[PDB]
């Protein structure tokens, strides 16, 4: 890999510079280099890997949605034929996004998840595995679509089972996992009532545990709870 000659600490330092410079493709390549050194990631390093790839795939998903919408409009009645270009360019962006999700999944499989024994790391990586299968499912339309949805599902469900055994209901990783999985149920699995149940239950269980928190932990947990409530408002 092109980062093989760079020190682990210098890749971490440059990922944090690239974040300040709003250059997450660079940030994700430094963090990929850091994971490929083979050592476990600390909590802060785990956050840099997830912010980098989320911003890379977020730009791809936004572009794919604009191109899909133009392509679907082109495919209505009374719409003028414009040739293969919208389809081709949608496919080029899709293939690129698939390749970034495959890269993240490959890092988790080789071998971040197998080496993660603490609940905070293992839940974090399994949430990421669910998230990146979810972005694959967002563009899937072929014979493996069911299987991609099930792989997301499986990963999120293993993360939920560990989170509920090992973490308090206000833990921000547990809350962001529940937020994410609820959106998987609503948008991917066509299960809006499972989505709304999971967001309500997660919000109420976290509310009841706020009293145990410091001011700073309270602010971290309530920020995520407000996202659950905003989705519930958008779904009910």
């Amino acid at each position: 890999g092109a980062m093989g000659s760079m020190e682990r600490a210098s890749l971490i330092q440059k990922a944090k510079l690239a974040e300040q410079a709003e250059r997450y493709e660079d940030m994700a390549a430094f963090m990929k280099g850091a994971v490929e050194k083979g050592e476990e990631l600390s909590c802060e390093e785990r956050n840099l890997l997830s912010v980098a790839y989320k911003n890379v795939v977020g730009g791809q998903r936004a572009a794919w949605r604009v191109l899909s919408s133009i392509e679907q409009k082109s495919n209505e009645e009374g719409s003028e034929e414009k040739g293969p270009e919208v389809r081709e360019y949608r496919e080029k962006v899709e293939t690129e996004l698939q390749g970034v999700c495959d890269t993240v999944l490959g890092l988790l499989d080789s071998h971040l998840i197998k080496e993660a024994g603490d609940a905070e790391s293992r839940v974090f990586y399994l949430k990421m595995k669910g998230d990146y299968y979810r972005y694959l499912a967002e563009v899937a339309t072929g014979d493996d679509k069911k299987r991609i949805i099930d792989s997301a599902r499986s990963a999120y469900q293993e993360a939920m089972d560990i989170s509920k055994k090992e973490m308090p209901p206000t833990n921000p990783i547990r809350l962001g996992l529940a937020l994410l999985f609820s959106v998987f149920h609503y948008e991917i699995a066509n299960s809006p009532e499972e989505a709304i149940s999971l967001a309500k239950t997660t919000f109420d269980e976290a509310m009841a545990d706020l009293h145990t928190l410091s001011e700073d932990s309270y602010k971290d947990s309530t920020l995520i709870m407000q996202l659950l409530r905003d989705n519930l408002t958008l779904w009910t």
Partner: peptide
């Protein structure tokens, strides 16, 4: 729908 991280 909101998901994290941003």
């Amino acid at each position: 729908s909101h998901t994290l991280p941003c």
